[PDB]
């Protein structure tokens, strides 16, 4: 297949390709977002896998050692949503929650979770 | 540290970086050469570890989806070796034994690797 599936096979953890795919993890450039509680909800149950596919993640990190803004993040999608929600303004942006990204319409716990902290980061 | 150390550490065999370095395998780039037989040689002995290696070897392969020549294999050093040697021509070059490699003072095990899987690359 493709890049995350071949990483994740990789690392042992293929079991959970689908699993993260369907909830919106699909790129490993934005996977490295994942966070404790997000395997928890995706339904990655195990405690063992839970701590050994972030170690690989923070492994993953440390190796790769407007609308316009929605393109850079791929999140393009979403803009629809965004305008249709009166959330042109950067302004408004910088202090969304995830509940309002996820109110707006962006189901998929991972992408709004690569637009949650997309946001963040953009505050510094 | 590095990019293949962390890879190493990502697949769990860390252990074999000094010794895959300190024989020359030292990038990432060019890990994909190893041969069964060059781990035996490495002292990787065990077999265990020299399957699995040599699967992410693979799975890594998989993922990535003239003097002048020596410089674009990361193999300059050699350039000394070669035209001490009187290997200028790719003719010579073409039909080089992996000893010839080693005869002319490649001692390396992955560089003289490296630099032989190269011309078989180029017989093709």
Redesign the interface.
Known sequence: C??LA??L???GLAQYYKVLVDNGYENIDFITDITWEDLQEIGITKLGHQKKLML?VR??A??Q?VGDWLDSIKMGQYKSNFMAAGFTTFDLISRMSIDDIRRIGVILIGHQRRIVSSIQTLRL
């Open positions: 493709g890049r071949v990483w096979s990789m690392i690989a492994k993953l440390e190796l050692k």
